[PDB]
């Protein structure tokens, strides 16, 4: 019935307003109702002449032209098959070329949508008309400068559609030389700059253009246009902050460009690399939820290119990063990535300290300060957060488990970074090997050990087979799955390498807290074992421990816990004496 | 001997004096300083380090005393002065690579908080936000944030909530003298509402004042609101939600159609303006909350529903999901005479999606999936979602969204059939079962051979299949002979012999149980 119903309703101009909408409803019903093979192709063969005669007439308008374009968009939505796709191609590419880059309606948008949905069939012989479309693309891209240069202070959605259409139409077919012409267009790209909303629309047109220029992350091309990409990066900083989705897509396109070696080496020499995590790569005052992606991109960039940055660049980079390392609103994953970046950059700063009279000691100490501050903050808050929900004597809990794991990895990354930093300040600024630390960094290290002996307590929480967290026992004499053994071994290594008579003061001041935490956390006993096993540091630590325990001997008769702790400590002391007689 | 500027500027003697005053037996040393607060005034102004030294000593004194607060008005008159001074902010922000005096802000904020917690100074308490969320943050955030989050909404407004809110509103005048935009004016909305909610579970004049004082686009100047708009919308939402109910709201909201909340939210979220998704969707949520409790207007609820459905394009997930959770049960209850009407409007907006807008379709599918309980009476609308799931599962769902959404949408119809039988299009249900059979044994290959997630969802899909056969929908299920053959015959090709066949074996075992219930399948085991 659909056939004879849609055919009998044939009406050109006798009823322009509502008859076309009724036929649109009828064809929508036809599309929602299944059609058989005998009622499949003839429908389209009849629709095509109808679409032709309806587009022949009626080229901010709200006239029957609108419902005509809507009927066309529905015929597009059909997507029945491909056999009858040839004349529709001609009609579409004929209606595409005219009345573009002007105050035209969305007719061209649905036109590019059907063009995209059309080339999926891989039609060889239609490459000539799409080649003419690419010639029109050449025209409009070269015309863009004049367009923005004619509209001054005294729509705009066609370029993104055309760009994404050309992208999806150049990705599927055989690789041809037309992409090199599109590259030459990227050389002629526009780089200069409610009507302000239209200018921002032009900015996002340029952003979509760049998104198409992402091809720089593909087969190599002759890149002799650094000035154009620099101007585009400037426009990016000039882009609006209210649009979150477009800014996110732009940051993605940027990080994709920065994901190749031949493009990274040209970034640091641009504006002295001052355009880092300062409020350029993120919304100025609108939104900062996409901050993780920008921070990860910047971290990867600075990591790949750290070997070519002077003192000022790395100093201000650390200044900008230490600010976000402490941000509680960011997920702990970003904090771990920033700690990794800092501990990987510490070695580069140390190696570069030979130049420009050094000046690295100050920055290294100032970032060791933020490292110990993060240690203290996590030992103060993360430990409490987990202890306030432990199930003694054993969904949001699934995510709390992942958070606990992120904290368990954060403590390890912090320990490793602190070790690498201790290796740093003791090997730069002339320089004298094993220089005695000054009182400032000595007290900083005292507080560092005092706060890290607590952060290491995160390894006393376990995950059960039902999802609920479980608090570990006080003492079980196990291996702890080997996860934390290396962590506290590196924690001890941090101190095994420093000056002997500074170790002496640090541990003479912190030995009571050490035994206290060991009694409250038996896993820390290996720290003393590592101190006693490392040469050049076992004698001092053993002497301090015995001098502290000889006065606390009567305390072994009161309770059994501290008595056993002191017994194990004396056993370790005797083992060390046997090893370092 | 230590307070001599010549010796007080030296780092060595200054550190020595700090360590001495920090000692436990420094009681008499602290008293001689508490007896002369004017001394610090001469230091709290190249000799700029004396400011930091004085701020450090004051912090030690405050920490060791905890009561020398009411006698230091003349001191805080200069301590707060440097806190709010733009010179301090700039000097400490511009260059902070390796600059000394790094802990000055933390101690300054600490002593300011210690002073303001003994006497309730509104201007000082609100100016404290200069480093609570905005400004500079190096260990300075949490110490004050946790206080304002837990201690403030515990005993602060136990007696004068209304007067305190009026003072915080009158703060606009002194605030505009030094801070004109969200950077402070937006943060002041948090300290008040933690208590407003803690005690929201009493202040009528404040409800009337907030509406008229903060007229739509306050001061008739929309250009200055960037983030304050979102927090004001959240204020209005949680206000119409908990603290003032109809009893207190209807008194002044009778003029909703006027400059009141309704016009404060509707024109911005309706028009294409306010491209910022946050403010637009927060206004949508405010309208949803208003509709949920009162304001039964001339069918504008359907307009809001449509604007929400068509607008959740890319990243509106959280806010639109909350707005639907708050509004989805409101429209049908208050549209009894238009149940069929709203359902047909939903169908319309669904069929007008011929572009298929993959992300929009996924968002709509998730929306209709969350509310399983509100579409049992519209079985007519199952064909569209079933046909959409069929094509969703066929796409290369390397991403997490498509096929997981498809399998949970299949679980949706499973539960629908469960509640229908134990209080449907037969061919489409058979196709749904065949799809659950196919997708269940197809996701096993999406993940690598081993050492990766993706198997728990396959197991839960197998459980869904096991459970879907207990209802009386099993008799017409079709055997996927060709799919099973192709997948398990892969073993003939030693490449790609992953456990996918093992899940296919478990599914063949489930169908073996089915034939154990109905031996008719014996004739269908030929393949």
UniProtKB/Swiss-Prot annotation, chain A:
The Swiss-Prot or TrEMBL note on domains reads: The PI3K/PI4K domain is required for the recruitment of HAT complexes, and the MYC-dependent transactivation. Although it is strongly related to the PI3/PI4-kinase family, it lacks the typical motifs that constitute the catalytic site of PI3/PI4-kinase proteins, and lacks such activity.
Entry superkingdom? Eukaryota
Report which gene this protein is encoded by: TRRAP
Return the protein name: Transformation/transcription domain-associated protein
For this chain, the family text in UniProt reads: Belongs to the PI3/PI4-kinase family. TRA1 subfamily.
The consequence of residue 578 to F is: Found in a cutaneous malignant melanoma sample; somatic mutation; induces cell transformation and confers resistance to apoptosis
Quaternary structure annotation from Swiss-Prot or TrEMBL: Interacts with MYC, E2F1 and E2F4 transcription factors. Interacts directly with p53/TP53. Interacts with GCN5L2. Component of various HAT complexes. Component of the PCAF complex, at least composed of TADA2L/ADA2, SUPT3H, TADA3L/ADA3, TAF5L/PAF65-beta, TAF6L/PAF65-alpha, TAF10/TAFII30, TAF12/TAFII20, TAF9/TAFII31 and TRRAP. Component of the TFTC-HAT complex, at least composed of TAF5L, TAF6L, TADA3L, SUPT3H/SPT3, TAF2/TAFII150, TAF4/TAFII135, TAF5/TAFII100, GCN5L2/GCN5, TAF10 and TRRAP.
Subcellular location per the Swiss-Prot or TrEMBL entry: Nucleus
Outcome of substituting residue 150 to C: In DFNA75; uncertain significance
Signal peptide stretch: none
The record's function comment reads: Adapter protein, which is found in various multiprotein chromatin complexes with histone acetyltransferase activity (HAT), which gives a specific tag for epigenetic transcription activation. Component of the NuA4 histone acetyltransferase complex which is responsible for acetylation of nucleosomal histones H4 and H2A. Plays a central role in MYC transcription activation, and also participates in cell transformation by MYC. Required for p53/TP53-, E2F1- and E2F4-mediated transcription activation.
Q: Which disease is it linked to?
A: Developmental delay with or without dysmorphic facies and autism: An autosomal dominant neurodevelopmental disorder apparent from infancy or early childhood. Some patients present with intellectual disability and renal, cardiac, genitourinary systems, as well as structural brain abnormalities. In some cases, the phenotype is less severe, has no systemic involvement and is characterized by autism spectrum disorder and/or intellectual disability, sometimes associated with epilepsy. Affected individuals manifest variable dysmorphic features. Deafness, autosomal dominant, 75: A form of non-syndromic deafness characterized by late-onset hearing loss that involves mid and high frequencies, and progresses to encompass all frequencies.
Curated annotation (Swiss-Prot), chain B:
Q: What does it do? A: Adapter protein, which is found in various multiprotein chromatin complexes with histone acetyltransferase activity (HAT), which gives a specific tag for epigenetic transcription activation. Component of the NuA4 histone acetyltransferase complex which is responsible for acetylation of nucleosomal histones H4 and H2A. Plays a central role in MYC transcription activation, and also participates in cell transformation by MYC. Required for p53/TP53-, E2F1- and E2F4-mediated transcription activation.
Q: List the disulfide bonds.
A: none
Per the record, the gene is TRRAP
Question: Which illness does the annotation name?
Answer: Developmental delay with or without dysmorphic facies and autism: An autosomal dominant neurodevelopmental disorder apparent from infancy or early childhood. Some patients present with intellectual disability and renal, cardiac, genitourinary systems, as well as structural brain abnormalities. In some cases, the phenotype is less severe, has no systemic involvement and is characterized by autism spectrum disorder and/or intellectual disability, sometimes associated with epilepsy. Affected individuals manifest variable dysmorphic features.
**Effect upon mutating residue 347 to L:** In an ovarian mucinous carcinoma sample; somatic mutation
Altering residue 266 to C: what's the impact? In DEDDFA; uncertain significance
User: What's the impact of mutating residue 332 to L?
Assistant: In DEDDFA; uncertain significance
What is the protein named? Transformation/transcription domain-associated protein
Entry text on domains: The PI3K/PI4K domain is required for the recruitment of HAT complexes, and the MYC-dependent transactivation. Although it is strongly related to the PI3/PI4-kinase family, it lacks the typical motifs that constitute the catalytic site of PI3/PI4-kinase proteins, and lacks such activity.
UniProt family annotation? Belongs to the PI3/PI4-kinase family. TRA1 subfamily.
This protein's species is Homo sapiens
Query: What domain of life does the native source organism fall in?
Result: Eukaryota
Please give the start and end residues of each transmembrane region. none
Q: Where is the protein found, in the record's own terms? A: Nucleus
Q: What is the effect of changing residue 404 to Q?
A: In DEDDFA; uncertain significance
Report quaternary structure and partners. Interacts with MYC, E2F1 and E2F4 transcription factors. Interacts directly with p53/TP53. Interacts with GCN5L2. Component of various HAT complexes. Component of the PCAF complex, at least composed of TADA2L/ADA2, SUPT3H, TADA3L/ADA3, TAF5L/PAF65-beta, TAF6L/PAF65-alpha, TAF10/TAFII30, TAF12/TAFII20, TAF9/TAFII31 and TRRAP. Component of the TFTC-HAT complex, at least composed of TAF5L, TAF6L, TADA3L, SUPT3H/SPT3, TAF2/TAFII150, TAF4/TAFII135, TAF5/TAFII100, GCN5L2/GCN5, TAF10 and TRRAP.
Where in the sequence is the signal peptide annotated? none
